[PDB]
Amino acid sequence: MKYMITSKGDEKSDLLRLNMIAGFGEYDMEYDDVEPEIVISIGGDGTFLSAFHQYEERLDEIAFIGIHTGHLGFYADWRPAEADKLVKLLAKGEYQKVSYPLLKTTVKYGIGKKEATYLALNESTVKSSGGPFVVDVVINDIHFERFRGDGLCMSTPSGTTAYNKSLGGALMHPSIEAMQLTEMASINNRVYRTIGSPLVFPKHHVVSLQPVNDKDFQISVDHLSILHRDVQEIRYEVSAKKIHFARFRSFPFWRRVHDSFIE
Amino acid sequence: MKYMITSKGDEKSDLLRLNMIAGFGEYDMEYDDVEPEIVISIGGDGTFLSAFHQYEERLDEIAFIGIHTGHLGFYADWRPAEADKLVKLLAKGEYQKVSYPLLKTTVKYGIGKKEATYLALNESTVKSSGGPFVVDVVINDIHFERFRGDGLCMSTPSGTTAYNKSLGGALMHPSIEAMQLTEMASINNRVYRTIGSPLVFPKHHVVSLQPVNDKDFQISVDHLSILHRDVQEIRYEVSAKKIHFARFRSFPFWRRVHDSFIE
Amino acid sequence: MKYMITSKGDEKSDLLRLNMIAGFGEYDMEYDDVEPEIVISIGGDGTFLSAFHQYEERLDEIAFIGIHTGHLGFYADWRPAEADKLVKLLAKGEYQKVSYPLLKTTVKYGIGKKEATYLALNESTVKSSGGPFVVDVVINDIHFERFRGDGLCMSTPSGTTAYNKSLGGALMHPSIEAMQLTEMASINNRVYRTIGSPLVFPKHHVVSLQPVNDKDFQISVDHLSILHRDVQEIRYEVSAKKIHFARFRSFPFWRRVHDSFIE
Amino acid sequence: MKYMITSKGDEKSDLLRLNMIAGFGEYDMEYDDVEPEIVISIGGDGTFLSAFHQYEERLDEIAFIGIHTGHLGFYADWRPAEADKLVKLLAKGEYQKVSYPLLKTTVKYGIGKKEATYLALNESTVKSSGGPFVVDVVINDIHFERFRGDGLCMSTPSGTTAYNKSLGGALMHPSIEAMQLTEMASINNRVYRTIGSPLVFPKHHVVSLQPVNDKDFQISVDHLSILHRDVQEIRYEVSAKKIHFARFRSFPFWRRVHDSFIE
Ligand SMILES: NC(=O)Cc1ccccc1C(=O)NC[C@H]1O[C@@H](n2c(C#CCOC[C@H]3O[C@@H](n4cnc5c(N)ncnc54)[C@H](O)[C@@H]3O)nc3c(N)ncnc32)[C@H](O)[C@@H]1O
Ligand SMILES: NC(=O)Cc1ccccc1C(=O)NC[C@H]1O[C@@H](n2c(C#CCOC[C@H]3O[C@@H](n4cnc5c(N)ncnc54)[C@H](O)[C@@H]3O)nc3c(N)ncnc32)[C@H](O)[C@@H]1O
Ligand SMILES: NC(=O)Cc1ccccc1C(=O)NC[C@H]1O[C@@H](n2c(C#CCOC[C@H]3O[C@@H](n4cnc5c(N)ncnc54)[C@H](O)[C@@H]3O)nc3c(N)ncnc32)[C@H](O)[C@@H]1O
Ligand SMILES: NC(=O)Cc1ccccc1C(=O)NC[C@H]1O[C@@H](n2c(C#CCOC[C@H]3O[C@@H](n4cnc5c(N)ncnc54)[C@H](O)[C@@H]3O)nc3c(N)ncnc32)[C@H](O)[C@@H]1O
């Protein structure tokens, strides 16, 4: 099939990529980095996230695979020593796909800027452009809280082991179609009040962040962070789109969690 | 239809119950506390939990309703002033039902005691019988961690605003079919290691707690707490059974959260 | 004595200031905003912090007083209705002083920039200039941890009810001569490890933050935040200097905590 | 001098104890477990805590030393391989002493039971006798909060790395004369409100816990836990007494923290 391989660009990852290309040449496998059906990332989770975003417009037509040439990644979850076996099994195809949910972020502006949408595999976060971050949090059109603090983080299920975890969020199995909102350093006193707890939302729930005074915000989607100006609204919802993984063996999520954080 | 009304037993709740019975007498509504189709609880969330457990063997045939005669409850979410309207609308029926997921707890013993199962609407917790609480946590047959601490709490979605919240757990919308495990005071040092974060599990995942040395544990299910002896295993999974509520208007979960914790 | 009054600059605060000046004119009290012995701040805690920093070079010669024209402040802890009584009692003098500890922050640079020192009444924080914040944390010359995360916060005792509290830090009575370090969103996994817990340091302990790769950091001291370039070291220690308050009645710290966060 | 040695009672610890006694016999060192001047504990931190409580009535006349025959302890902080060097240096004396602060707990009863005082090296905790734990928290005679939850923990400085740490408390250098209060699972909602944050108190501050309805409590002091009945008040304050350690080299607290929790 059409495939491509992205590399972290260090010596180890580049050599593994060239060797896998040579192995794929021994099968009916065409290299095409325009319309691949298979996208292999070699490096770490950052490499894998860049691969996802390089091809985010063809997600339903691609099966992703990640190889970690450093320590075990949550997406880059296969070892370099298994690369030949990976080549053999992808070339023959007939493998099963596993799908993880994604986060849709919509940013609406004042007039002159059209709204923009972004897809996240880990999370989207919002922080101020300097000074206090203050937004009204509106859930399905219901005013829930006025948040004053450092920022907010909205995570996918597979993102829950990343920034979300450092913020106190729950780890959620990625078969759950949900998104999770965590606080960054909310103030709570006689004047200001937030829920504190992480909040877990199902599909079709919409969380809208609306500015109170300052309208400039630093918005991140996975590794990318951009200062957005004259923002009127930031809307989060579970995406209808899904990322598809090729799996060639059982490596359960909870075992990946164990392997990464416990032992 | 057949209905019954349970009361907290204070003056306010008993009088409201007698008045609602009188109002139901004005319709085709038979009082039956053996096979009710409608179970109305008057008091607080504790009253409602006792109603649920009184009828937990006929859950698929009952629609529950809670009236709070004190402050707003998460299950006792209707005001005494709306009791006449409640009577009018239940008697005519034709109302919609809302279903929340439940937690199944299985306790297995050494020989001589048969296993026991319990259903929880809020949560099930496990604590030691004195001294350190130590269990191996096994998720779908995979050894995940050895927990040493004060205890563990496994919450339903609607339970997440209760004990779970006080333990740092996420609040989850109750349409998500899941259960959530939180720690109570785990030790973490060079010898001992736990995940720390709350863990959110989907349907069909099984979490098994297995004793390491001491085999006696204090096990709670909602308000009930019993010392269990010669325990071999405690198994948690999302139940196939569901509790059904009568709803006569929109009172969204996230608005109940807001009303209870924010303002 | 020489005194001055700083105002938040809203209508309420400016009018109170002019009225207090008129009342001071009825005594032997000279207005001097160059060498005051008394510095009265009218507004909120931000106003009070700006007063402190305006006069931070004459701290041993000044008694500070804060009036809150909004809600109760932890430094602006007297009501506008008591302004006449305040005037009467300051003019006659003979009042007792209360002293709170301060935080000394030293920033050392590469060659071409001389080191700079800053005094904090609430806290000093450090965050990256974009991207991950990574520093080695060295305590009395002993390498304690490599921190990777969003940032770090070092609080005075009276600062512990401010940013420190939002970060999970302990509240400490301000008679304790100490400083407290809290984390902002540290990553912890197989590669990265931090203590997690807030750390409380006595006088003469020195905490040194040393860069690992990136050398640009956003450093804050109380309300002020500056991007510092080519930083070699950030050193924290309890200052030898103290801020002095005039007190005219008992308003215990723990009662201020209660009044601000409990009821 | 007079000395004694307490052992964990496993094979390793008993043999080390007999060998150290033999080595002490080669000097002017008399074994006396009634009035020792030196108390050596061999085992773990639990062994050391039992040694402390065995001799808590002669604390000003004793220098304690702990050897860990398992992993490094915070009190049992010397290795078995250094036992001969320990013998040599204790026998010659002339070593420096290091002192850590202690916690005084007073339990007052209804009539018929006289008040009781207890000294803690790690912490004192209070939990209910079954059901909710509810106390009024009074700080220097000022009503601070009504706590409803699982319990409360009051830690010494050297205790802050123990239970206190698992409860979210700050780690405090043990030269600070203070005690630290942490919550266990407080409920917070529209009816109930606590500070949440750990609270750090200096010497001479008194924290009084007063029952609201139930008067039976499980009170722990270090490893010991007793059910106390008809309790009227539990009072915490930093003790005037101090525990004294023999030190024969620099092993800084923050390095012990690093060695135990980081690497
Ligand atoms: N490039 C950087 O350095 C960013 C960073 C900033 C501050 C502090 C730490 C880092 C960090 O080291 N990053 C990578 C490590 O994250 C592991 N990783 C990644 C990923 C990725 C690529 O980077 C982008 C992601 O970084 C995260 N992130 C942002 N801020 C924080 C924070 N304060 N604490 C914790 N994580 C944070 C946020 O989720 C971004 O999407 N995905 C996952 C995952 N699903 N599950 C488990 N581990 C994951 C990956 O394997 C590494 O071990
Ligand atoms: N009878 C007691 O007093 C128990 C208790 C013990 C210690 C500290 C506090 C209490 C407590 O006051 N209980 C009731 C308050 O809980 C509200 N409530 C109840 C319920 C119920 C009936 O009681 C049993 C439940 O109590 C909980 N619980 C046990 N320990 C803790 C803890 N440490 N912190 C927080 N909650 C705890 C645990 O979930 C049990 O199922 N359900 C919910 C819900 N889904 N969402 C939001 N609020 C809820 C209810 O409306 C009241 O406001
Ligand atoms: N100007 C802003 O808005 C900053 C801010 C940014 C983000 C989120 C909230 C705010 C915030 O609203 N600020 C003021 C409120 O802080 C009360 N206050 C102040 C003070 C002051 C003046 O501002 C500067 C201080 O702000 C703090 N700060 C920075 N980030 C955070 C954060 N994420 N969460 C919580 N506090 C944060 C940090 O300590 C700075 O020194 N001192 C104290 C005090 N000793 N004890 C109790 N309350 C205090 C004051 O009375 C107000 O109620
Ligand atoms: N006997 C048990 O098993 C109790 C226990 C119960 C539940 C969960 C864990 C344990 C536990 O394993 N105990 C010992 C481990 O504690 C280290 N240790 C000890 C000590 C001691 C002797 O035991 C009594 C102490 O236990 C603590 N404790 C009570 N509950 C909890 C909890 N939930 N989480 C964390 N610690 C808890 C509480 O401070 C008691 O005074 N002192 C310290 C110290 N100053 N600094 C650092 N580590 C310490 C010691 O070296 C071991 O590594």
PDB file of C-alpha atoms in Angstrom, chain B residues 71-72 127 150 163 165-167 184-191 259-261, chain D residues 71-72 127 150 163 165-167 184-191 259-261:
ATOM      1  CA  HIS B  71     -30.868  21.564  50.933  1.00  0.00           C
ATOM      2  CA  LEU B  72     -30.751  20.474  47.310  1.00  0.00           C
ATOM      3  CA  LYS B 127     -10.384   0.176  53.995  1.00  0.00           C
ATOM      4  CA  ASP B 150      -5.757   4.108  53.790  1.00  0.00           C
ATOM      5  CA  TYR B 163     -16.944  10.766  48.280  1.00  0.00           C
ATOM      6  CA  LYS B 165     -15.038  14.388  44.734  1.00  0.00           C
ATOM      7  CA  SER B 166     -13.543  14.714  48.214  1.00  0.00           C
ATOM      8  CA  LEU B 167     -10.774  12.322  47.157  1.00  0.00           C
ATOM      9  CA  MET B 184      -7.094   7.389  49.897  1.00  0.00           C
ATOM     10  CA  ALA B 185      -3.647   8.439  51.162  1.00  0.00           C
ATOM     11  CA  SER B 186      -1.323   6.109  49.305  1.00  0.00           C
ATOM     12  CA  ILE B 187       2.257   5.994  50.523  1.00  0.00           C
ATOM     13  CA  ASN B 188       4.796   6.661  47.786  1.00  0.00           C
ATOM     14  CA  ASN B 189       8.505   6.273  48.343  1.00  0.00           C
ATOM     15  CA  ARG B 190      11.468   4.200  47.221  1.00  0.00           C
ATOM     16  CA  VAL B 191       9.668   0.956  48.093  1.00  0.00           C
ATOM     17  CA  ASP B 259     -26.194  24.781  42.048  1.00  0.00           C
ATOM     18  CA  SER B 260     -24.552  22.555  44.673  1.00  0.00           C
ATOM     19  CA  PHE B 261     -20.894  23.620  44.553  1.00  0.00           C
TER      20      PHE B 261
ATOM     21  CA  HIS D  71      15.791   0.485  53.155  1.00  0.00           C
ATOM     22  CA  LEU D  72      16.860   3.937  54.282  1.00  0.00           C
ATOM     23  CA  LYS D 127     -10.771   9.768  62.886  1.00  0.00           C
ATOM     24  CA  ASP D 150     -12.655  11.299  57.318  1.00  0.00           C
ATOM     25  CA  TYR D 163       1.442  10.436  56.703  1.00  0.00           C
ATOM     26  CA  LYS D 165       3.065  13.844  52.819  1.00  0.00           C
ATOM     27  CA  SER D 166       0.467  11.321  51.659  1.00  0.00           C
ATOM     28  CA  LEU D 167      -2.252  13.811  52.614  1.00  0.00           C
ATOM     29  CA  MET D 184      -8.467  13.695  55.211  1.00  0.00           C
ATOM     30  CA  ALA D 185     -11.303  13.863  52.657  1.00  0.00           C
ATOM     31  CA  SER D 186     -13.288  16.869  53.801  1.00  0.00           C
ATOM     32  CA  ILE D 187     -16.701  17.317  52.230  1.00  0.00           C
ATOM     33  CA  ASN D 188     -17.191  20.732  50.654  1.00  0.00           C
ATOM     34  CA  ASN D 189     -20.524  21.867  49.306  1.00  0.00           C
ATOM     35  CA  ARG D 190     -23.233  24.447  49.892  1.00  0.00           C
ATOM     36  CA  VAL D 191     -23.582  23.412  53.544  1.00  0.00           C
ATOM     37  CA  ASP D 259      17.455   9.892  48.697  1.00  0.00           C
ATOM     38  CA  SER D 260      14.043   8.592  49.798  1.00  0.00           C
ATOM     39  CA  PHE D 261      11.669  10.084  47.215  1.00  0.00           C
TER      40      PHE D 261
END
